[PDB]
Amino acid sequence: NEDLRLHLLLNTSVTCNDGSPAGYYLKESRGSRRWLLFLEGGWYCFNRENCDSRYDTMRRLMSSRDWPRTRTGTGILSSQPEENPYWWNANMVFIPYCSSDVWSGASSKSEKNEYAFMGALIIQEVVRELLGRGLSGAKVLLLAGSSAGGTGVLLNVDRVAEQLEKLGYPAIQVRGLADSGWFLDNKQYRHTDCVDTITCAPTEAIRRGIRYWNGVVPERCRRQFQEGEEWNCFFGYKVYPTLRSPVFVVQWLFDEAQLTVDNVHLTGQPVQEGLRLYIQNLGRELRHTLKDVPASFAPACLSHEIIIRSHWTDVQVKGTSLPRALHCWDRSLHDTPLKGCPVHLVDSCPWPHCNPSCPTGT
Ligand SMILES: Cc1ccccc1OCC(=O)Nc1ccc2cnccc2c1
Ligand SMILES: *[C@@H]1O[C@H](CO)[C@@H](O)[C@H](O)[C@H]1NC(C)=O
Structure with missing residues (x-):
């Protein structure tokens, strides 16, 4: 019995x-x-x-x-x-x-x-x-999420921490695990003005979305960017330094959704110099944004999402799997780096599938 049971909200x-x-x-x-x-x-x-x-x-x-x-x-x-x-x-x-x-x-x-x-x-x-x-008895609440849900972790983890503090539960340690939600507002490979859904780049689409949704962002980030610029807080490298809760970041260096919003569509045909350089620069920029993120796992693969996949244990960076790195993160947050138990795992090789443990796509 592996089953989670549905509860519709009472409110x-x-x-x-x-x-x-x-x-x-x-x-x-x-x-x-x-x-x-x-x-x-x-x-x-x-x-x-x-x-x-x-x-x-x-x-x-x-x-x-x-x-x-x-x-x-x-x-x-x-x-x-x-x-x-x-x-x-x-x-x-x-x-x-x-x-x-x-x-x-x-x-x-x-x-x-x-x-x-x-x-x-x-x-x-x-x-x-x-x-x-039962959550009243918790010692650790890990707010995790994949893709738009990983961006959701970055936008909401500190609000969960604040909510629990205000409700009288300051001993519950709130932490975040953001998978495949760390996007770049980078130069796209081809460009279209925002004239419909498919042509609208993420920064433009999110700036419209926030107004349509009455979107809210974390307070410290909102105070930095101010009115009209809250779309910035949807980009992990900009919102992460404003957060107080510990957050572990999982991101493929060549994330398929990032490539899609960059207007890159691979086809199995040979990749020519312009696109080769584009892809290599994407991986370098993603790596650069993770340089100062102490808890991170970023393999050099073309993929999207990992943490709820049944074979999530198979990928490794520098010989360490994601479940191992998450365990090492738990150890690091007990009341100095740990021998053989790393938490910062970012690939340095420059092309998708240069890591042999990347998902096969089968
Ligand atoms: C939160 C966020 C910020 C920055 C970039 C992306 C973000 O969210 C994910 C996302 O946009 N995903 C997809 C998924 C499928 C698509 C298909 N075709 C065109 C665009 C598509 C976009
Ligand atoms: C129900 O949810 C609404 C919207 O979030 C909130 O304002 C209201 O206080 C909630 N009611 C209760 C009893 O929690």
């Missing part, structure tokens, strides 16, 4: 995009004081037309009406040590992404809003409801 004002209740899937582990709260990813929408299209063909990302009663935990959400060497005995929570707002929104469906964008409030409400289901 029915906290909703998915279409006004159906948001929710969470939970598998308790009696007697563990560790809680893993995972934020699903799945891109985002930023205006009426592209949200309407998402509602037709990605409806589970906008509504709870068709969610199943259970889900199987995989990767870091597995309860089997064979699959999850890191946290197999933890309390497991999977929070479906049904707000299409990179977990940033704070707006309800109303006479002026066709859709609700409540991602930031969904996280707060899940935490509130879990406190009565």
